[PDB]
Every structure is written in C-alpha cells, then in structure tokens.
Symmetry: C2
Subunit: 313 residues, 2 copies
C-alpha cells in the first residue's frame, strides 16, 4: 500500500523525452524553472498526463498514413495523417497529440519506414526533416492529426508511403519549448511543472541528442523529470496518496553512502534544495528510497558542489 | 507481495530482443520449441538471467572503446573493446556478454556514434557491418570483451579512436540461434526455455527487423518470452513465488471478453495448450490478469484457430 520505487540506478534507466539511455542527473537553476514538458509526466497516484506513453520505444516517435504532393522549393513534401503508434486511429481528444509525439521545438530529422505487419512485408525507408516549432503558419497541426515533412534522403529509391512509423535521428536548432500543436488555437497541455518552495530546484534526468550544425555534430542535452521506468512504475501501481510529497533518499547501496535527500511531489517531479547559481551534477549509480510522506512545506537538507575552491576576487 | 501484472496491452509494449515496439502475439509449433534466448529472460521472483538488461534502450546494442585500422581490398576495420552501456568496465563473468548484447546470428548493420558525455561533445557517426555468428575466421568474442566490424571503403576514412555506442540498423541472413559468444569454449548461458507439458507451446511476443539484400528490404520476425515492461516489472518487484507457475487470463477490458488462459511458469516463460500445426496469432489489445498459483502439471484449457472451415479431404 505504501509508495515504493524500483531499485534501479538512473544510469541504467530509459529517457522519457528522447528515446535513449539516461546519462546524467543534475539540477541547474539557470534553466527555465517550470518546464511544460508533455512526455515523462505522471502523478504518484498513476495518472498519466500530456502525451506521455508507457513504452519508452514511443518516445518522440510517431506513426501515420503518408501521402505526397509536389512542392516548388524543396522537392517532395509528405503529408502525414497521424495514427497512434499501436496502429489505432488517432482521434483529437484531451492531450496535445498522439502519445509520445515530440514535445520540444527545432528542426527534427526523422527516419520513416513502411509499417511492419508480418514477415515478408516489403519495406521502404526515407529520411525527412520536419519543423516542429511555430513557424508563423506552416500547417503543422499534430493535435488535429496532420503534419508535413520534406524528403532529405532516400535509403530506398522508392519513397515510403502508406502506413508508416517515424523515429527521431538528430535535431537542428533545438529549443526546449513545446511546439505549436494546434496552430493558433488553445490545446490540452499538462501544466508547467511546479510549484517549488524557495530554494527548491527541479531534479533533471538528462540524455543527449545529436545536434547538427555547419560542418560539425555535437551532443545537445535534453532533460525529463522522471525516467521512463518510474513513469510506467507509477502508472502500473496506481498508489494511494497520503500527503503532498514523498521524502526520498538517494543512496549508493554498494558503499552505503547517502548522497542527498529530495522531495517527490505528488504531481510527479522531484525537488532538491540548492542555493548555487551554476549546474550541479550527481553520480548516476545510486537508488532512490522512499522515506515517508511529508508536507509541502517540509524543508530539505541542502546540497552543493563538491568543488570547494573560491577566490577573493 | 500478491504477485500481479501491470495492465498494459501487448501492442503498447517494448520488445525485449530487438529495440522496437511489440507488434504480434502468437504461438507457432513449427518454430524451435525451446529457444535459448539470452535477453528478455527473468524469473517471476525477479532473478534476471543471461544478458537481460532493465532498460529496453539497451536491447541489441553495445558500447566500446573503438580502435580503427585500414586494410586494402576490405575497408576500415573496427576493433571494439567492449564496455557496459552505462560506460562502466565490462568484466567477463557469469553471463555471456555485456548486458543487452545481441543474442541471435546473422550479419548486423550497426550505427556507431561517439559517446555523449556532455553538451558540446563533438559527435561522429559511421555504419559498420558485424557478423554475429561463427562467421568464418574472426575472434568474435563478446564474452571476452572484444568484437570486430567493418565498412567497405576505397581508402581510409578519418576515424578517431575513442569511446562509442553502437545501435542496430538492419540484419542480413538472420538466424535465431545464439552467436558464438566465447569461440569454441563453454560460456555461461540462460538455459533453453522449457520444459513444456505435452500439448503446450511457447507464447511469443513478436516484433520485426529490417532484413536487407541488394536494393531490397523486408520485415523479418523475432520473438521474445516477455515484453520488456514485464521483464522490468518482475526485476523491480522481487515477488515471493509459490508452486510452479501462475495461471493467467488474457482479456479484452473494453468488451470484457476472455480470450484465453495460459501458464506463466516461474522460470519466466508463458505456455498455451494448442494442438494445431500452423501459427495461431492473437489480438494484441488484451491484458494479462493473474488468476492463481498452479502446479507444473496443471492442464490449461486449449485454444484454436477461429476459422472452423474443414474439407472432406
């Protein structure tokens, strides 16, 4: 009956916003304090929010029927009439897009393959680039079930069409801000993450995206509030909630070293007490242990950087 | 306590042997009855077997210290000194390879990228071909921590030696038998799946790999005993077991329809009683519900094909 957590190290976890392993664990107060992320969002009681999928393989992916219409500038624009990734029809409802749809902006390179239904299905593979963010009006409406992308590479020599699946490859001009999901119109969104007590900052699980630039490719950070294993854990257990937050300890179980305490708020984000200005990273080889229910106003033991050097200045 | 299962439909799950969604759920008695899969293996009491990772982002992937050398007539040849995918050192131990290492044979196209440690790290990407099975003359020895791959090339590529992560792209000449992990030497392996009673057959959760050839590509099936979400469920829960199996019912929750019953043997594989010769597929929109502990000798209600047609010969 009491909430517990799986004893899984962050470095062994799956990322909830880009389909890759978790590499980092940190707080940063220079970043936006209350992000509006649509994936990786669940309450402690198991209520999934936004576009958050159960399966980590759905993260920042989509599925569609693909069809073509020719275009003047860039050749060969595909129209993608979205479907949910399990092949079921997508119906505009009470979330921003199909489950696992990307919840950030920039120009995404996606690889698109013919839907696989049985051994022997002939498969085509085509790479596209897709503009996720507002861009004035583009007729990007993933809420309404229709998005567009331009061909960048044929792997196949026969352009992919029909029912397809799209996976993310790399990003250009990444901005961690949600994309126009519904043109200019109001869309259903999980709320900004928060609020935090004074001195509290969001615990971030970090992975890296291949970001392209002029004649260089470099890692670009993307954060989520909980790893996918914790998202599906809460969804699957549907625990009864008894306070506003849980007090957690993050501990290395081999050595016994207690690393920090933190607060998991019932709305599915974790807070650390930290007064520094720059990023503070933690080891990713500890485990989270639930300690007890605590009230909102519970004051955490603070953490700080292990580098103690300072200057007179 | 009280062993239960997450209410997750198969079509919403992640596969445990190839990094992609589950698409199919079926029995085939024409397939090998007792496969020796190394990934997707876990006991109901939470004991992980073989090379089974927690994270589905680890499945059929590896990480390595890459060293590169050119050979005329062949191309660039990569020597990969294996590490675990979290970056920790790989030590040959009580399993056949680093966690999540491919557990089947054939020639695998891998995409290899510089390891992502922090934002700004410059990234290079190259596609290699890696022969998994005996594959003629090589010291393919993932158990000892060293594997080789190549790319056909007219002259040297620019390749810098360093830490990499490798992900699977396509397969050629797929065979679902384990690779030679340790040359001609004995190696630690999860046992063959089984035994089954007379008339019982393995339940297969199915996904599809891109299997290639010249200017052609087709879906090729691969099966696993449990989706990854069930693998991480039993590992995280560490349930106390009783008896020799759990009786489960697979049901559609929207219609209420009971589809079949099956036995989840405590050693982590599911049987169904089926006397047909050909494949029998099932809908992937049901849920598995735990009904009871049962003995090894428990006789399941049989299933059969929904097509009743027969000819007088």
């Amino acid at each position: 009956r009491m909430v517990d957590l799986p004893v899984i190290q962050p470095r062994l976890c799956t990322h909830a916003r880009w389909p890759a392993p978790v590499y980092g664990l940190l707080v940063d107060p220079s970043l936006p304090s209350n992000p509006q992320w649509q994936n990786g969002r669940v309450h402690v009681d198991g209520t999934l929010l936004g576009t958050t999928p159960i399966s980590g393989s759905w993260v920042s992916c989509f599925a569609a029927e693909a069809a073509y219409e020719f275009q003047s500038g860039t050749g060969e624009v595909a129209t993608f009439t979205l479907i949910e990734q399990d092949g079921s029809a997508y119906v505009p409802g009470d979330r921003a897009a199909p489950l696992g749809y990307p919840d950030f902006s920039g120009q995404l390179e996606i690889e698109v393959q013919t839907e696989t239904t049985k051994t022997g299905d002939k498969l085509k593979v085509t790479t596209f680039e897709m503009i996720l963010g507002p861009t004035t009006n583009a007729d990007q409406a993933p809420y309404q079930g229709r998005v567009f992308a331009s061909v960048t590479a044929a792997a196949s020599l026969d352009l992919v069409d029909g029912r397809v699946r799209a996976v993310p490859r790399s990003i250009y001009g990444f901005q961690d801000t949600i994309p126009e999901y519904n043109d200019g119109l109001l869309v259903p969104l999980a709320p900004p993450i928060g609020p935090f007590l004074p001195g509290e900052v969001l615990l971030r699980f970090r992975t890296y995206m291949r970001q392209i630039d002029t004649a260089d490719a470099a890692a670009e950070a993307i954060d989520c509030a909980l790893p996918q294993e914790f998202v599906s854990w809460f969804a699957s257990n549907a625990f009864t909630v008894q306070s506003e937050a849980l007090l957690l300890r993050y501990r290395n179980t081999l050595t016994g070293q207690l690393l920090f305490e933190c607060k998991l708020y019932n709305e599915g984000y974790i807070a650390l007490s930290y007064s520094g200005s720059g990023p503070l990273t933690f080891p990713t080889d500890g485990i989270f242990e639930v300690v007890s229910w605590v009230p909102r106003l519970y004051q955490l033991a603070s953490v700080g950087s292990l580098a103690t050097g300072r200057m007179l200045k």
